[PDB]
């Protein structure tokens, strides 16, 4: 689903 | 330290 799609593309953004 | 600072500010960026 759309939820799993967005969860797959996540990245770790910090400073 | 600086290492701990960057880890504290992390966020999850996706679509």
């Amino acid at each position, epitope marked *: 689903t759309l939820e799993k*799609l967005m*969860k*797959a*593309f996540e990245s770790l953004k910090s400073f | 330290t600086l290492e701990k600072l960057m880890k504290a500010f992390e966020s999850l960026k996706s679509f």
Partner: antibody
Amino acid sequence: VQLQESGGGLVQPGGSLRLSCAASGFTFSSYSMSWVRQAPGKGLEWVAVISYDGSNKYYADSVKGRFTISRDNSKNTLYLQMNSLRAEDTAVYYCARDRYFDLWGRGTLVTVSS
Amino acid sequence: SQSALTQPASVSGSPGQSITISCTGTSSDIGAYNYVSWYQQYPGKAPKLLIYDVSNRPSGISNRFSGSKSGDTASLTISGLQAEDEADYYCSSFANSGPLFGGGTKVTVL
């Protein structure tokens, strides 16, 4: 800062192959990574994506159940296991970083024919 | 095979001029999201992000490149057209089933 694919080659229909993508010059662990392919003289086609920590994967309908994407953050490598290969899978395969696809490799050649 | 997003096959331009590459999507792609990107690819080279999120430009990208979106169509504009602009240009959007790409547009400089 660069991506370099490898593992491409010529294979027969139904055969299997595994692509590798070596990342350098940044922290691999922090970015989601994707596989994008391009058939001869055709547009780019997104294949699969895996999370920064490898916990969530997603596949296109054209490769779901046949392709397996994975990563090993400790060696800075992205993998693509390709099973039950078809002629239509013939393409140049790129690995692209993050949701913007802001960093690509030069690509690796995969040809499936008889 | 027909590409998900539609781009012109080719566009030529004289040096110094401006050209616009259109990219037509559908109801649920370019129109539904503000997640359109543009890429420049030289033959045998790695694709390069020119513009993301319709109009936003990465640090090392020339300001001769600009992006916009009206309805279901996105556009890439190259101004001050020069030799080094001759390449393939692809648009990408976002969709419920995953990122979509256009067929690509070959730009020719005369």
